[PDB]
C-alpha cells in the first residue's frame, strides 16, 4: 500500500474542434498509464497470493 | 442553467454567481441553454476554462 | 473518415455578375490539358465590364451528414495583376456559420515562384454541421466552394508508406 | 476613445473585451461613424487590435452580426491601454484573481 499511495493526477481538459490530434495524445497517455497501473496491479496481487499460500 | 462563457461575461440570466466568489472546484450541467447570447466565437475559450479550473 | 459522399455545394451559376470560366492556370494542369484548376474549387475572375461586383452565396443544412468544406483566397504579385482579374478598390472574403467566423483581404507581394506562379493561393476548409448554414460574401479574390462532401464518421489512421 | 488602467495592488485581473462585425455597411454606417474603424489594446505584454469585417453571417438568436469575445489577465503591475475608432465592446468589469490548480467537471 506504500509504493502504490503514489497518485498519477490527470483530468481531461476540453479540447476544441481544430485540437483533435492533442485530444487523441490525451486520451492515448491516459489509456496507456490506466492500462499499465491495472496490469502491474491485478498481476501482483495474483503473484503476491500464490507465495503468500506458499508461504 | 448556464455555462462558464455567460458566466463570467455575463449573461444576464446568470447573474446568481458575482461579486467577490471563492471555491474548490465549478460544476457545469450538460443541456445548459445560456450561454453566449449575441453570437460569436470566444477566442481561447478551452485555455480559458483551464485557467479558471485553478 | 469511415465514408464520404461528393456533391455540389455552390455551383457556378451561383454567383452572378462574375466570369466563372476563365479560373484556369498553367501551374495546376490535367494529363490532358495544361491550363485547368481545382475541380472543388472555382477560380472567380472578372467579366469584360469591371468592378467585380459584390458576390454572394448560401448553403442550408438539412439532411444529417457533416459537411466537410474548402475555399480559398488569392494573393497576387503586383496591384497590376490584382486590377486585372479582378476590380478596383478594398476586396475582402468573408464567410460565416452558426459557429464559423472568417474574415481575409487580399495581401498583394512577390513571392518566389513555384511551377511558374509568383502569386499565391491561400487554402481553408472547414465542416459545416448538421442543421448549420453558411453564408459567404465576397469583392474579390474568392476562391469559391464548388464541390464539397458529406462525411460520416469512426475513429482511423493514416498511413505513410510505399 | 481612449481608456486606461494602472495595476497598484497583488491581484491579477481577468478581463474581456469584443469586436461587433455588422452585417452591411448600412448597420456600421448606422451604429457607428463612417471611415477605417480599428479597436486596438496594450499592455506590457499583450498587443491586441481588430478590424471591422462586416459580412451577413447566418442568423442565430434574431442575429447576424457578430461580436468576437477576447479575454486576457493583466498582470500585478501591468498597465492597460484601449484605444478605438469604432466597433468596440468595451470592459466594465474585471475579476481581481488569485489562484490555486483545481478542475472543472461537466456532470449533472
Same mark, same amino acid.
Given at each position: 500500500? +506504500?509504493?502504490?499511495?503514489?497518485?498519477?493526477?490527470a483530468?481531461?481538459h476540453?479540447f476544441? +474542434?481544430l485540437e483533435?490530434?492533442?485530444?487523441?495524445? +490525451?486520451?492515448?497517455?491516459?489509456?496507456?498509464?490506466?492500462?499499465?497501473w491495472?496490469? +502491474?496491479?491485478?498481476l501482483?496481487?495474483?503473484?503476491?497470493?500464490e507465495?503468500?499460500?506458499?508461504? | 442553467?448556464?455555462?462558464?462563457?455567460?458566466w *463570467?461575461? !455575463?449573461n444576464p440570466?446568470?447573474?446568481?454567481?458575482? !461579486?467577490?466568489?471563492?471555491?474548490?472546484? *465549478?460544476?457545469?450541467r450538460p443541456n445548459?441553454?445560456n !450561454? *453566449?447570447?449575441?453570437? !460569436?466565437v470566444?477566442n481561447?475559450?478551452?485555455?480559458?476554462?483551464?485557467? *479558471?479550473?485553478? | 473518415g469511415?465514408?464520404v459522399?461528393?456533391?455540389? @455545394?455552390?455551383?457556378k451559376?451561383?454567383?452572378a455578375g462574375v466570369?466563372?470560366?476563365? /479560373?484556369?492556370?498553367?501551374?495546376?494542369? #490535367?494529363?490532358?490539358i495544361?491550363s #485547368?484548376?481545382?475541380?472543388?474549387?472555382?477560380?472567380?475572375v472578372?467579366?469584360?465590364?469591371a468592378?467585380?461586383?459584390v458576390?454572394? /452565396?448560401?448553403?442550408?443544412?438539412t439532411?444529417?451528414?457533416?459537411i466537410?468544406?474548402?475555399?480559398?483566397?488569392?494573393?497576387?504579385?503586383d496591384?497590376?495583376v490584382?486590377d486585372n482579374?479582378?476590380?478596383?478598390?478594398?476586396?475582402?472574403?468573408? @464567410?460565416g456559420?452558426?459557429? @464559423?467566423?472568417?474574415a481575409?483581404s487580399?495581401?498583394?507581394?512577390?513571392?518566389?515562384?513555384?511551377? /511558374?506562379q509568383?502569386?499565391?493561393?491561400?487554402?481553408y476548409? #472547414?465542416?459545416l454541421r448538421?442543421?448549420?448554414t453558411?453564408?459567404?460574401? #465576397?469583392?474579390?479574390?474568392?476562391?469559391?466552394?464548388?464541390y464539397?462532401?458529406?462525411?460520416?464518421?469512426k475513429? /482511423?489512421?493514416?498511413?505513410k508508406?510505399?
Amino acid at each position: 500500500i +506504500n509504493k502504490m499511495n503514489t497518485q498519477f493526477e490527470a483530468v481531461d481538459h476540453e479540447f476544441s +474542434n481544430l485540437e483533435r490530434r492533442i485530444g487523441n495524445l +490525451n486520451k492515448r497517455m491516459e489509456d496507456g498509464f490506466l492500462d499499465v497501473w491495472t496490469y +502491474n496491479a491485478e498481476l501482483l496481487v495474483l503473484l503476491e497470493n500464490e507465495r503468500t499460500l506458499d508461504l | 442553467d448556464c455555462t462558464i462563457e455567460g458566466w *463570467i461575461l !455575463g449573461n444576464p440570466k446568470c447573474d446568481l454567481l458575482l !461579486g467577490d466568489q471563492s471555491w474548490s472546484y *465549478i460544476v457545469e450541467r450538460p443541456n445548459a441553454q445560456n !450561454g *453566449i447570447c449575441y453570437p !460569436g466565437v470566444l477566442n481561447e475559450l478551452e485555455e480559458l476554462k483551464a485557467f *479558471i479550473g485553478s | 473518415g469511415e465514408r464520404v459522399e461528393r456533391f455540389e @455545394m455552390f455551383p457556378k451559376s451561383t454567383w452572378a455578375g462574375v466570369d466563372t470560366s476563365r /479560373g484556369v492556370t498553367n501551374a495546376c494542369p #490535367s494529363y490532358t490539358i495544361d491550363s #485547368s484548376f481545382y475541380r472543388n474549387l472555382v477560380w472567380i475572375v472578372k467579366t469584360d465590364s469591371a468592378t467585380y461586383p459584390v458576390i454572394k /452565396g448560401t448553403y442550408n443544412n438539412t439532411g444529417t451528414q457533416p459537411i466537410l468544406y474548402f475555399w480559398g483566397v488569392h494573393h497576387p504579385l503586383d496591384t497590376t495583376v490584382q486590377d486585372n482579374l479582378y476590380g478596383s478598390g478594398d476586396k475582402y472574403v468573408r @464567410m460565416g456559420t452558426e459557429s @464559423m467566423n472568417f474574415a481575409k483581404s487580399p495581401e498583394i507581394a512577390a513571392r518566389p515562384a513555384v511551377n /511558374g506562379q509568383r502569386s499565391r493561393i491561400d487554402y481553408y476548409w #472547414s465542416v459545416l454541421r448538421p442543421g448549420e448554414t453558411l453564408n459567404v460574401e #465576397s469583392n474579390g479574390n474568392l476562391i469559391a466552394p464548388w464541390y464539397a462532401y458529406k462525411f460520416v464518421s469512426k475513429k /482511423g489512421a493514416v498511413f505513410k508508406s510505399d
